[PDB]
Amino acid sequence: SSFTKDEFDCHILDEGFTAKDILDQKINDKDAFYVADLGDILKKHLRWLKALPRVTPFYAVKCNDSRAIVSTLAAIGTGFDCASKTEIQLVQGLGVPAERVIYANPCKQVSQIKYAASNGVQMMTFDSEIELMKVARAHPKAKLVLRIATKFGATLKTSRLLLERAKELNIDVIGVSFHVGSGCTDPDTFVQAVSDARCVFDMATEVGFSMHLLDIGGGFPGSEDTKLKFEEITSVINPALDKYFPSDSGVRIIAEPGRYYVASAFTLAVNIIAKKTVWEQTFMYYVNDGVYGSFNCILYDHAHVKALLQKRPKPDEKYYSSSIWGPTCDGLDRIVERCNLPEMHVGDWMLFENMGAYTVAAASTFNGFQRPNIYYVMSRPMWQLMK
Amino acid sequence: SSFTKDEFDCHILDEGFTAKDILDQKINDKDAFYVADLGDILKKHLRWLKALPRVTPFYAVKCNDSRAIVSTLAAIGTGFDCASKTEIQLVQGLGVPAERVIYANPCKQVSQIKYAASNGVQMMTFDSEIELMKVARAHPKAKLVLRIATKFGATLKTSRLLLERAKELNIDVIGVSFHVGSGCTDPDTFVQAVSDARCVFDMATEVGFSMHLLDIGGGFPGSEDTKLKFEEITSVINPALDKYFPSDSGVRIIAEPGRYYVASAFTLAVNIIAKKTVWEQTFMYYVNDGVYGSFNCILYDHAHVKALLQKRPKPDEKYYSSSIWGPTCDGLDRIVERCNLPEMHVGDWMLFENMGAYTVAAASTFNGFQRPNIYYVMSRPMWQLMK
Ligand SMILES: *Cc1c(COP(=O)(O)O)cnc(C)c1O
Numbered sequence: 169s170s171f172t173k174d175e176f177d178c179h180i181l182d183e184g185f186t187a188k189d190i191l192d193q194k195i196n197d198k199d200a201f202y203v204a205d206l207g208d209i210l211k212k213h214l215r216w217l218k219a220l221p222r223v224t225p226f227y228a229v230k231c232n233d234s235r236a237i238v239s240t241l242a243a244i245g246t247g248f249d250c251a252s253k254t255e256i257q258l259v260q261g262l263g264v265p266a267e268r269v270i271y272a273n274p275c276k277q278v279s280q281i282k283y284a285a286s287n288g289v290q291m292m293t294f295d296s297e298i299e300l301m302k303v304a305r306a307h308p309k310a311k312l313v314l315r316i317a318t319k320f321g322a323t324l325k326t327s328r329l330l331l332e333r334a335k336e337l338n339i340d341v342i343g344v345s346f347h348v349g350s351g352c353t354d355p356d357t358f359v360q361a362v363s364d365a366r367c368v369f370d371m372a373t374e375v376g377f378s379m380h381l382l383d384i385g386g387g388f389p390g391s392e393d394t395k396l397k398f399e400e401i402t403s404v405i406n407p408a409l410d411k412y413f414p415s416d417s418g419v420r421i422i423a424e425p426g427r428y429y430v431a432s433a434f435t436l437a438v439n440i441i442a443k444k445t446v447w448e449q450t451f452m453y454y455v456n457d458g459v460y461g462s463f464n465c466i467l468y469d470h471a472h473v474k475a476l477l478q479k480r481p482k483p484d485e486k487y488y489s490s491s492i493w494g495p496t497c498d499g500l501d502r503i504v505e506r507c508n509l510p511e512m513h514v515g516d517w518m519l520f521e522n523m524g525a526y527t528v529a530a531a532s533t534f535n536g537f538q539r540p541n542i543y544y545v546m547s548r549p550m551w552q553l554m555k
Numbered sequence: 556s557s558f559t560k561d562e563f564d565c566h567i568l569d570e571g572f573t574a575k576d577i578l579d580q581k582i583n584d585k586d587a588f589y590v591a592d593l594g595d596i597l598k599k600h601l602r603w604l605k606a607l608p609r610v611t612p613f614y615a616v617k618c619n620d621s622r623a624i625v626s627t628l629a630a631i632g633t634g635f636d637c638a639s640k641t642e643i644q645l646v647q648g649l650g651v652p653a654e655r656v657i658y659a660n661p662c663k664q665v666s667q668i669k670y671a672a673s674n675g676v677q678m679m680t681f682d683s684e685i686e687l688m689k690v691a692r693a694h695p696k697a698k699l700v701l702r703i704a705t706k707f708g709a710t711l712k713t714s715r716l717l718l719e720r721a722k723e724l725n726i727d728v729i730g731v732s733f734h735v736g737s738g739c740t741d742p743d744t745f746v747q748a749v750s751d752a753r754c755v756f757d758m759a760t761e762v763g764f765s766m767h768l769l770d771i772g773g774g775f776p777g778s779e780d781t782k783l784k785f786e787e788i789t790s791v792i793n794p795a796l797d798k799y800f801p802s803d804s805g806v807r808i809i810a811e812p813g814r815y816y817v818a819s820a821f822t823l824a825v826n827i828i829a830k831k832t833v834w835e836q837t838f839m840y841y842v843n844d845g846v847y848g849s850f851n852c853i854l855y856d857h858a859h860v861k862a863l864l865q866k867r868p869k870p871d872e873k874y875y876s877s878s879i880w881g882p883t884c885d886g887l888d889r890i891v892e893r894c895n896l897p898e899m900h901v902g903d904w905m906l907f908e909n910m911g912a913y914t915v916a917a918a919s920t921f922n923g924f925q926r927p928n929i930y931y932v933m934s935r936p937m938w939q940l941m942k
């Protein structure tokens with residue numbers, strides 16, 4: 169059972185078959201491939217509506233720009249955080265209205281600002297006086313959001329000057345945004361950011377702006393590996409929002425989650441293409457995706473990946489010190505430096521879960537190695553819910 | 556004046572106009588762009604024929620796979636070092652015969668080995684017993700080259716065992732390859748590798764192979780920044796080749812240069828899209844290519860880039876501590892951490908020379924930021940010579 173829409177095919181899971189079961193079915197040229205569970209994205213959306221009922225999510229497209237993902241999120245009602253002309257074209261090309269887009273790049277090429285003005289995208293961020301000069305010339309009627317620091321972010325000591333400069337240029341400033349990021353292992357950083365945002369809203373009132381938009385950014389975890397759970401963060405954000413930004417004020421609260429929505433939806437299957445033995449003693453395994461491909465996340469996103477075997481465990485099997493390398497002819501294309509694994513063979517598969525964020529979006533075809541095909545799946549109940 | 560061939564356009568330089576002059580002419584949307592001097596590649600080829608007259612160069616396609624570069628090198632007579640099916644398809648698609656290709660990837664996917672066998676590519680490298688098992692099944696008549704260590708490389712202590720295993724499998728082993736790499740700042744490492752290769756040729760004679768192919772790998776510098784000059788390396792390699800591999804023996808010597816041929820041929824022009832001032836005191840400049848794009852070389856190739864201004868110097872201008880950042884909405888997309896520069900403005904260009912190697916080949920469109928267009932140029936004298 170399958171369905172087609174927005175130039176993608178999606179298999180519908182019927183019994184109690186899960187995305188993991190489909191993966192096994194495909195394994196039962198042997199190029200690496202992904203199984204992407206669109207149902208996991210709807211699950212994440214329901215969980216978001218429950219945890220942060222006052223906060224509208226604007227998906228950060230740069231995390232994973234796969235057409236099916238963006239199509240799915242659009243269908244379920246998210247907004248989009250776009251940072252370039254291409255990202256805006258992607259979202260508008262899927263039928264999403266300009267009002268559901270925030271151009272949340274504080275430092276934008278002037279031609280790309282002109283593109284947003286021409287296509288009706290009015291909401292953009294900024295954090296510098298030169299950005300205001302550019303907006304004055306290229307999108308004078310835009311609705312600006314001041315990005316504050318917790319590369320980017322205006323200090324509280326310098327925000328007042330920017331707000332006065334915006335008023336001098338007759339630019340409307342409608343709110344404040346911040347981005348804590350995923351590195352943070354403390355929910356209190358989000359709380360302090362909300363408090364800093366309220367200070368800036370009050371400064372803006374003194375300058376003559378009646379701000380109404382609070383954007384709490386991204387960094388929410390999308391996988392279970394992370395120590396700090398999503399609901400540990402949201403449970404402390406909610407009281408801060410109620411304290412500093414009561415609903416009676418007319419304020420609109422939004423966020424820019426990326427990895428939250430898509431990290432766990434993608435599982436990557438790679439095949440063991442080559443193998444060396446350094447003396448049964450230690451083993452080196454070469455696989456058909458690597459650091460120039462999906463595992464660029466180890467270098468750009470500081471991600472921590474974990475190799476899982478696809479075959480079922482065996483009683484009392486022996487474990488050996490092993491290393492896992494990518495397919496390129498580059499000595500630094502190494503995925504796992506040292507791990508303990510049973511003896512594996514060429515043609516065997518290894519699985520890498522929680523591979524949806526900052527993976528496919530930044531992969532290249534360096535050395536001619538192609539991108540893994542992505543197979544989409546969705547449970548029957550989730551398929552019905554989306555419609 | 557221009558010419559077209561193999562789906563690319565090339566401007567012919569007429570007066571005493573140089574690639575740098577064309578760059579200035581184009582500057583006189585403002586997207587980043589490259590100027591690639593195909594004449595510089597022919598210059599590099601002439602310099603190679605002079606410096607290493609007994610060594611046939613097999614260009615390492617993975618360095619820079621731009622169609623015009625591969626087309627040019629084919630036209631002037633190089634061989635090609637390919638590491639994947641896609642790379643082989645590229646070279647054969649430009650009309651290069653299988654005899655001018657080495658499949659110099661020691662750890663290859665079995666389907667890709669089958670592809671090479673089907674398309675007549677017989678010469679491949681290896682460095683492990685499992686690789687021999689794969690070749691026995693998928694390309695039994697291949698001509699193998701043993702890659703020795705100076706991820707890859709058989710030790711001298713383990714090469715004899717491999718050679719015996721190849722004989723047991725009725726696999727023909729025709730030679731030895733090594734790869735010193737570009738990190739090396741000493742020409743004596745190349746000399747020791749040649750001596751180690753001769754030890755392996757003698758071991759192979761004892762086992763029953765009459766080796767004839769010596770492959771000296773890559774790592775030769777393609778830019779003037781490098782301390783160790785090309786001719787400093789070649790001047791010590793030649794006597795080693797004459798000592799250990801006399802021409803009277805019938806030996807064929809080849810190499811796999813990548814960066815040598817193309818590093819200096821490409822100059823990247825980026826525009827300053829955004830700017831911040833941290834207090835006239837210090838300046839932060841944002842440009843329209845970055846670490847997910849052309850400057851991935853800083854992370855993957857450990858490259859050292861240097862920002863040059865495009866505008867002409869002015870008398871007694873003031874210099875300031877500055878930082879240069881890429882266009883993405885990623886806090887680590889930083890190109891130059893600290894440098895001293897005059898005050899620059901949005902719309903001004905910065906130039907990055909010696910940007911041909913390991914740059915465009917590994918760039919992505921992460922965050923929607925597009926790849927810079929490449930404009931090809933060639934002097935009149937070089938155009939004539941190539942034909
Ligand atoms: C990348 C980024 C996001 C998305 O971050 P996640 O960690 O994927 O949630 C949101 N906003 C900004 C400004 C970003 O730079």
Ligand SMILES: *Cc1c(COP(=O)(O)O)cnc(C)c1O
Pocket residue numbers: 497498615617618636659734736737772773774775811812813814815
């Ligand atoms: C990458 C590489 C080359 C090319 O290296 P350069 O430093 O670009 O010359 C040649 N041979 C092998 C085996 C390589 O891995």
